[PDB]
Design a protein around this ligand. Structure first.
Ligand SMILES: CC(=O)N[C@H]1[C@@H](O[C@H]2[C@@H](O)[C@@H](CO)O[C@H](O)[C@@H]2O[C@@H]2O[C@@H](C)[C@@H](O)[C@@H](O)[C@@H]2O)O[C@H](CO)[C@H](O)[C@@H]1O
Ligand SMILES: CC(=O)N[C@H]1[C@@H](O[C@H]2[C@@H](O)[C@@H](CO)O[C@H](O)[C@@H]2O[C@@H]2O[C@@H](C)[C@@H](O)[C@@H](O)[C@@H]2O)O[C@H](CO)[C@H](O)[C@@H]1O
Lengths: 303, 303
């Protein structure tokens, strides 16, 4: 059975790990030989494994509740707890965090060094919406204990000169990274522990690399005393749903990979890629490929 | 030529007219017998007609430039021009506004009662990104001439108590509607005319209705003397790209429509819709259908 791939350029696809920013390049790096992400992982057989979705934009915004306190030492870091509608009762066999929430990495207990940014507003006391939405810095855990600093839990802390209102609900739309956060710290993701079904960490076969659908993430700061010192950066994914949702019509034959041709201009230059059934695609071998081109189904090869 | 529709529920699809908020219902109304929208227009043959796109979230954010001026009387309304990076030659045969920008209606010669809201922030001095991004009431045109009030051009006005910086670029993320905006004023789209290729206004055959893929839009206001007075509303579309993207394997036979079965409640209940070649769906001759079901291909019928 042959596979028909529509001629959709990579520049017209969604970025699962960072919507609202179009794809700019295809990035291959020789220093990145693993992937422990939770968003953007798909499988031919199992569908959307891990904590991903087929509607990244719909589930990108979340809500949380203040807990009337602050972390020890730093009085500006108000503690708060994420709100999860998909798992009302805290059943250990289901993921704690809401579906589709971000997982960008920040550091092994990193404070002054770097943080992340978001939009945040209190409830309107009317049930209709929110008020006074502005930028703030946030992070997972409390950056004090090793057991829950990078643990992908439902407890976070947010910087605010004033004090949060206890028992009220706030909205979160995370967009930006602050402090000293480079590309490497964002590439890695916080660890996860428990008994729920989370996506494992893959590794490429010896002698191959991985495409990363790289994008560009700009900055958003605040001109005020102790404001938000943030910087521009880049963000990467593994696979977008648009490319892989086509294969469901005719699944991969047992123990077989696909050979793909990427055509840039006319027929002058053609690149050869290999797609596996576990989600990632490889390239034999470090540079950047332009995003204007179309994919082609060549043949089936053995892994 | 058979059509095989994957069992994706409508609750896991994107809303072209308003990303960042999932679809909650399927809405049919007897007072809406036309559609002059510019976002969400798709066809079997021409692909994305009008100003539509297959990546709604990528092109949702825009930018504009201030012009150092104000409308007569209401100085608070500073004029500005949208920035276009696809027709950088102001060619009349190409669309003026950028792809994927908002087209919510707000009324005719009437801005002492209603307005639209957007996240606006000024540029920094390093190219890193934007800064001090906050909510701002905005609208099309200048509310003075009949030919430039609701005309879908690249000139807008934004309310700001302070003075805008001339020649600086600002970012726009439209999210919310304020004042006295109800659902009827948002359903109608601003009129467009000229020489460029725009999408026409369709009408259903007599004896049928339209399914609208409706979604809920919350409110975001500001606590200040001349602050934002936003309201909660609903936003409807015509068709999401996920449903039409599959039909491209085998196009519809000439002069023929399709019958689709909507199966909910474990099959117990099943609805019957008719899908045409232009993009819209028709239901026999007013309520809300739940969003827990999957579409099923029944057969081909004559229109
Ligand atoms: C989260 C918080 O409350 N402060 C950030 C802030 O850094 C602070 C910090 O550097 C202290 C001393 O270390 O001095 C200032 O408060 C500083 O604020 C930042 O630096 C000044 C110069 C301004 O740029 C100000 O706008 C800015 O907020 O950011 C650093 C990043 O290194 C840390 O993240 C602190 O937690
Ligand atoms: C765009 C602008 O500057 N003002 C809006 C505002 O209405 C004004 C208006 O009603 C005038 C007199 O008509 O009186 C106030 O300024 C009023 O402001 C609004 O009402 C007060 C109580 C606050 O809520 C304020 O934040 C709010 O702006 O909204 C109306 C819609 O009714 C128009 O949009 C005006 O242009």
């Amino acid at each position: 059975p042959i596979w028909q791939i529509p001629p959709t350029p990579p520049g017209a696809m969604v970025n699962p790990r960072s919507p609202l920013t179009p794809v700019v390049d295809l990035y291959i790096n020789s220093s990145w030989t693993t992937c422990n992400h939770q968003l953007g992982r798909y499988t031919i057989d199992g569908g959307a494994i891990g904590n991903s979705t087929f509607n990244p934009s719909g589930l990108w915004t979340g809500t949380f509740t203040a807990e009337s306190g602050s972390v020890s030492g730093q009085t500006n870091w108000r503690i708060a707890m994420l709100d999860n509608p998909y798992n009302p009762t805290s059943d250990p066999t289901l993921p704690p965090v809401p579906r589709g929430f971000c997982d960008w990495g920040s550091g092994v207990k990193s404070g002054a060094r770097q943080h992340l940014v978001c939009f945040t507003g209190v409830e309107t006391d009317n049930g209709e919406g929110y008020k006074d939405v502005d930028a703030h810095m946030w992070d997972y855990g409390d950056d004090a204990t090793i057991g829950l600093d990078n643990t992908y839990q439902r407890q976070i802390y947010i910087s605010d000169p004033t004090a949060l209102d206890s028992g009220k609900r706030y909205i979160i739309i995370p967009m930006g990274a602050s402090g000293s956060a480079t590309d490497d710290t964002l590439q890695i993701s916080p660890n996860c522990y428990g008994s729920w079904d989370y996506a494992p960490t893959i590794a490429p076969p010896l002698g191959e690399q991985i495409v990363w659908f790289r994008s560009y993430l700009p900055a958003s700061s605040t001109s005020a005393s102790s404001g938000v010192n943030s910087v521009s950066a880049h963000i990467s994914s593994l696979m977008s749903p648009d490319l892989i949702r086509s294969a469901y019509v005719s699944g991969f034959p047992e123990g077989k990979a696909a050979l793909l041709d990427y055509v840039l201009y006319g027929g002058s230059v053609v690149e050869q890629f290999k797609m596996y059934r576990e989600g990632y695609l490889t390239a034999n071998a470090g540079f950047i490929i332009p995003p204007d081109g179309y994919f082609r189904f060549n043949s089936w090869v053995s892994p």
